[PDB]
Design a protein around this ligand. Structure first.
Ligand SMILES: C=CC(C)(C)[C@@]12C=C(OC)C(=O)N3/C(=C/c4c[nH]cn4)C(=O)N[C@]31N(OC)c1ccccc12
Ligand SMILES: C=CC(C)(C)[C@@]12C=C(OC)C(=O)N3/C(=C/c4c[nH]cn4)C(=O)N[C@]31N(OC)c1ccccc12
Ligand SMILES: Nc1ncnc2c1ncn2[C@@H]1O[C@H](CSCC[C@H](N)C(=O)O)[C@@H](O)[C@H]1O
Ligand SMILES: Nc1ncnc2c1ncn2[C@@H]1O[C@H](CSCC[C@H](N)C(=O)O)[C@@H](O)[C@H]1O
Lengths: 396, 396
């Protein structure tokens, strides 16, 4: 039968595991191949037609995780694998015991929970992972505000006959949230009860961005006086700055600045001052870059929020204003998408940004963004196996 | 490292494959265990926190499949694995080449397509499966009308503080489609351009429902005159009737009836008459069962659309009207959900029905539906490994 196909796919899984289990630390390519072959084996087991039903399984699973997390089922359940009944869970959260039982059927068969017995469930480390800092900031915001729009990508493109009408202020997010005209940050910050959850999600860093990719000690110490300064534009929480103060520590009493919109600077001002950095409110769309002539202006996970034109050039030009030609420099820190062999990690970030008019850029895409803004490529800082790179640039 | 955990999970995959590859045909339990262990291996490879990002990967993948299918990318691409470029695809569909490239990143790394080279893609049998009858009827309707509501299950339950306010006419479907008051069939049939796609999706039968589970030859041949009759209520296309005429063929010139709402009977009337069955319009909510005293009244994949009360009892009572006490009989054909060990196949059907006020029932749930409508359990017809059973019932 097809039992032949299962057998060949199991062989490839074993072969890939053996490769992965004897490679060194050189996020490996072996690790992703083993995932790939594991995935093939499932699909082959299911067969082509039944595997096309995995979109409906996937959708209800996400919908059930989102509901269970929002209704406090994850927090009500004993961390550590101890069991708890539907009735107990229903009592402590007020989620209808009938809905809860139905919802649990999507997150126990394979899902991150364990069905210990009838109406009886336990955490596993995969469910409890939804409680960690990274996931707990990131998942509720994505599921309450972003998943809906992403699903509506098709509807938005349909209205323009599959043409790219997508903009920062007219996109599947404005369509789904019925807010044409507002960018996503505008719409979320407008309601103050979103500021805490959104700034937490902005702190999410599941893949642990490599901040030692660039020599902060070198460029910042050869900086006399006013050039000994680093601006972390749309710095948000500041963790990127903390990590740069944590990647060169022999400081010549240096100036460390974190600019962001008002409600963000509000949330982190006290904690940023405390750690000795200075919080200033700034809008790289309306205003020009206040701090003149700093050795670097640093952009981490900002430019994937914006298209080349208009906002892209407007960012780069509003801060070209304050740059010394020969002594200031611009650093763009973002995913660098390969032109072939992209992973699901590129895909989910890029396509979620599609819903708000953003986009992850290839190396060629960054080249055109520089050209359009009259900037010279200095160096593309990559430590391969990193998805992030740093685009270093000076004024032409 | 964790390399220990990968190794133990690979061993369980191999062990489960060996079990599956030496079992007989007794939809196996071995087949699902091997899927389970394959799934564990992926999750272990990724580690708990990064695996919690698979909700965002899953959402963009569904969103990208839906867009690519709706924009005709599946139909433009050479069936059989021959490659085609982004530009070629973009030319034949009018989908923006830039959107297309971005979208393809979600369906090539593991997705059902193959990235042959830069901007170059091929079908596989897993992508082409989206073109078969079953998937092509079922997937567009689910993705255009159902996925949205399912994601909004959380929003709906939130409005009532996680309490079950869900009804046939007030539910995540009415919330998402802004149509409070209308049931789902009402809302979709209201626009006539939905009738063809929805009736096709109603014909979907990916898991191939077992129609030989019940002895049609026996009960229908011991039927004299007016009792030699079968009513396929909400029969829709008729395939269930065709299969009953295709599971007993020594007919005493018998009467085969397919009742459904008007726009459905319209689509299938000509093709139903041709095959010698009679199409009559009937609404098991408004009217009483016209055809009196038939040996069976047959319900396939209807009752999971409706709650016990109100519509559930109203169905069973509107057709109790036409039943002979001792010679008519009721057959309910639906998934029978186990109280433990449900699969993702139960879960996606039950939780998608949640969005419209429907539900898949356990054996105990069917017991209460009978009690509430004054019907006696005759026999629960199950051939285990079938997810469907038949609930046989007579008037108490
Ligand atoms: C919703 C959360 C925010 C606002 C923060 C987010 C913005 C980001 O750009 C500035 C970002 O980097 N994000 C995430 C990074 C992450 C999480 N774990 C590991 N890396 C993330 O979850 N969501 C996002 N992201 O995705 C690329 C988004 C996609 C569509 C709208 C908004 C966003
Ligand atoms: C959208 C398609 C319809 C209207 C037909 C559908 C109705 C069904 O009940 C009468 C049904 O049986 N369905 C399917 C069966 C199937 C497909 N492949 C293998 N079995 C299916 O895809 N969708 C549904 N279903 O799911 C249980 C639904 C869930 C929420 C709303 C509407 C439905
Ligand atoms: N018009 C604007 N001017 C300045 N900052 C803006 C802005 N619009 C959005 N931002 C900020 O850009 C940030 C992007 S997410 C945080 C990025 C941060 N540097 C990090 O890598 O973790 C948000 O905190 C948001 O408030
Ligand atoms: N009020 C109503 N009265 C009668 N039929 C209805 C109805 N509301 C919905 N239906 C029908 O019930 C059917 C359910 S799906 C088709 C089921 C079919 N017996 C099969 O197993 O393939 C739909 O075709 C729908 O039109």
């Amino acid at each position: 039968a097809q039992k032949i196909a299962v057998q060949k796919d199991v062989d490839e899984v074993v072969a890939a595991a053996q490769r992965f289990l004897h490679g060194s630390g050189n996020s490996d390519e072996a690790k992703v191949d083993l995932q790939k072959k594991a995935s093939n084996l499932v699909q082959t087991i299911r067969g082509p037609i039944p595997a096309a039903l995995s979109s409906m399984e996937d959708i209800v699973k996400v919908a059930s995780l989102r509901t269970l997390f929002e209704a406090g089922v994850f927090h009500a359940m004993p961390k550590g694998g101890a069991s708890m009944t539907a009735s107990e869970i229903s009592a402590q959260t007020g989620l209808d015991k009938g809905i809860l039982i139905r919802l649990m059927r999507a997150v126990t068969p394979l899902g991150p929970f364990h069905e210990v017995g009838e109406e009886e469930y336990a955490h596993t480390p995969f469910s409890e992972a939804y409680l960690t800092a990274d996931i707990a900031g990131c998942f509720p915001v994505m599921s309450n505000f972003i998943f809906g729009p992403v699903l509506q990508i098709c509807d938005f493109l349909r209205q323009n006959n599959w043409k790219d009408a997508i903009t920062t202020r007219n996109n599947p997010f404005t369509l789904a949230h019925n807010c044409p005209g507002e960018t996503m940050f505008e719409h979320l910050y407008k309601n103050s009860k979103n500021v805490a959850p959104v700034t937490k999600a902005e702190a999410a860093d599941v893949d642990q961005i490599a901040m030692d990719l660039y020599p902060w000690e070198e460029r910042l110490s050869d900086a006399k006086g006013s050039n000994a300064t680093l601006v972390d534009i749309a710095g948000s929480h500041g963790n990127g700055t903390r990590a740069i103060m944590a990647l060169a520590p022999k400081l010549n009493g240096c100036r460390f600045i974190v600019q962001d919109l008002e409600p963000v600077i509000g949330e982190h001002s006290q904690a940023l001052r405390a750690e000795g950095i200075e919080p200033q409110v700034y809008d790289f769309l309306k205003q020009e870059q206040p701090v003149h002539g700093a050795s670097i202006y640093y952009f981490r996970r900002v430019f994937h929020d914006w298209p080349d034109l208009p906002e892209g050039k407007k960012i780069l030009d509003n801060t070209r204003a304050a740059m010394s030609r020969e002594h200031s420099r611009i650093l763009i820190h973002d995913i660098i998408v390969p032109e072939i062999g992209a992973t699901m990690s590129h895909a989910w970030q890029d396509l979620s940004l599609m819903a708000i008019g953003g986009m992850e850029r290839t190396e060629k895409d960054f080249a055109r963004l520089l050209d359009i803004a009259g900037l010279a490529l200095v160096k593309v800082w990559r430590k391969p196996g990193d998805m992030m790179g740093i685009i270093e640039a000076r004024l032409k």
